Amino acid sequence: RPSFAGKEYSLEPIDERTPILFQWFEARPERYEKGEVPILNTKEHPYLSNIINAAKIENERIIGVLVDGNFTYEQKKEFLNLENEHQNIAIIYRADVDFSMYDKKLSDIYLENIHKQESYPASERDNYLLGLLREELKNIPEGKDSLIESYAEKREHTWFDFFRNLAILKAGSLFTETGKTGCHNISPCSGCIYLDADMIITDKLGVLYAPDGIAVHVDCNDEIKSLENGAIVVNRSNHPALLAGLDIMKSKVDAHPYYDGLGKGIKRHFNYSSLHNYNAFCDFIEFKHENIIPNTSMYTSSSW
Amino acid sequence: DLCAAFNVICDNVGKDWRRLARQLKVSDTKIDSIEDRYPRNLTERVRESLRIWKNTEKENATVAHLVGALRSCQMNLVADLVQEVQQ
Numbered sequence: 001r002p003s004f005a006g007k008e009y010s011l012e013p014i015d016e017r018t019p020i021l022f023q024w025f026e027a028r029p030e031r032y033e034k035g036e037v038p039i040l041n042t043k044e045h046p047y048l049s050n051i052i053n054a055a056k057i058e059n060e061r062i063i064g065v066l067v068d069g070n071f072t073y074e075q076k077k078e079f080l081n082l083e084n085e086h087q088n089i090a091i092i093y094r095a096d097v098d099f100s101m102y103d104k105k106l107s108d109i110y111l112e113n114i115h116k117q118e119s120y121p122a123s124e125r126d127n128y129l130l131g132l133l134r135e136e137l138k139n140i141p142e143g144k145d146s147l148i149e150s151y152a153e154k155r156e157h158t159w160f161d162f163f164r165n166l167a168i169l170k171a172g173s174l175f176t177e178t179g180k181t182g183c184h185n186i187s188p189c190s191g192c193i194y195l196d197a198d199m200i201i202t203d204k205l206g207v208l209y210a211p212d213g214i215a216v217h218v219d220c221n222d223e224i225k226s227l228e229n230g231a232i233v234v235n236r237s238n239h240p241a242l243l244a245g246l247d248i249m250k251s252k253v254d255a256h257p258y259y260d261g262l263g264k265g266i267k268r269h270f271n272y273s274s275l276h277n278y279n280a281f282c283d284f285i286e287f288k289h290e291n292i293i294p295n296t297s298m299y300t301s302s303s304w
Numbered sequence: 305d306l307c308a309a310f311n312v313i314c315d316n317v318g319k320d321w322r323r324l325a326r327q328l329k330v331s332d333t334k335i336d337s338i339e340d341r342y343p344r345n346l347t348e349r350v351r352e353s354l355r356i357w358k359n360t361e362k363e364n365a366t367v368a369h370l371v372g373a374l375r376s377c378q379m380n381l382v383a384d385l386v387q388e389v390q391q
């Protein structure tokens with residue numbers, strides 16, 4: 001049985017009907033030609049093609065794509081057409097998903113943190129941060145006093161990182177609550193296999209196994225390992241490691257959805273601290289599969 | 305030169321520093337170390353992240369690269385000041 005920080009875990013099965021989730025958040029939907037699905041699909045970044053081929057291979061699953069951006073009416077027809085052409089593809093708009101169970105007011109986050117900084121002795125506090133918090137509190141946009149709405153507005157990478165974590169918390173229920181055809185088979189508490197669009201599936205994945213039900217991509221560049229969020233598998237909705245990360249996003253004012261919402265969440269979940277060895281933890285939590293060619297943007301360029 | 309760019313960033317970037325760190329590809333475990341070492345000093349966390357990027361990218365650690373990253377993660381006003389102080 002796998003173990004870390006003095007505790008043993010089960011390799012939990014992620015069964016072969018678990019849906020697969022991709023993501024495409026488009027800051028520049030005007031860049032596509034008329035009649036094109038607005039998911040990047042160049043020779044350099046053949047991402048829509050990769051997603052279609054995944055759905056073709058995994059014919060017994062639903063392949064979802066969580067999308068966001070100011071799509072035109074014609075682009076929304078192209079998404080419908082895409083779904084009509086590929087039976088097991090679900091296009092899921094961010095704005096249509098019910099994330100409200102994960103939200104928190106920004107004003108509460110700031111106020112709690114102000115009180116936290118005031119509880120420290122004056123010589124031991126972050127005086128600069130305490131001043132920023134008081135000014136942030138005064139400048140919350142009207143009607144936008146919401147952690148989730150504050151990320152929905154962004155157009156840089158934290159926009160897709162933040163909703164990626166929440167969509168994986170929803171997991172099976174992301175799919176069941178769309179009402180789309182074919183999603184009848186998934187349960188609200190089912191797990192989810194999240195992949196970047198450059199994660200190439202070459203054959204059926206079958207049953208997956210993950211310590212305590214979660215595993216994530218590990219990048220290894222120049223003998224240096226890094227936990228990454230470009231593949232994430234969970235065996236159930238509201239996985240406790242992602243709940244721990246959401247709690248941090250709700251508490252830590254300079255939190256980042258990748259470093260904190262995913263990374264610190266999974267570290268806390270397994271009691272990883274500065275006492276422990278990062279490479280050993282990477283080895284422990286790693287998701288890798290012989291039928292996936294990982295992160296093929298490494299051969300071209302990053303799309304963000 | 306880079307030092308003046310770092311000064312402009314530290315003077316202007318607060319709550320969102322990790323977005324810039326991620327755009328600069330500062331690793332997850334190095335962010336852990338920064339936070340451990342400067343738990344009550346946000347500005348020093350920004351500066352340490354910039355220093356780590358510089359040490360990691362070596363000669364590719366240029367003002368141009370820094371400005372491109374600022375623009376890419378939508379800190380365009382900070383990038384403006386950086387380019388202002390440079391010229």
Ligand SMILES: O=c1ccn([C@@H]2O[C@H](COP(=O)(O)OP(=O)(O)O)[C@@H](O)[C@H]2O)c(=O)[nH]1
Pocket residue numbers: 022023024025026027160195196197198230295297298301302303304
């Ligand atoms: O404009 C963008 C760029 C990227 N992504 C998401 O970011 C993932 C990672 O992109 P990529 O593999 O190109 O970059 P990497 O992070 O590996 O450098 C993609 O699969 C998408 O899910 C996105 O939603 N919109």
Ligand SMILES: [Mn+2]
Pocket residue numbers: 196198230295296297298
């Ligand atoms: Mn990639």
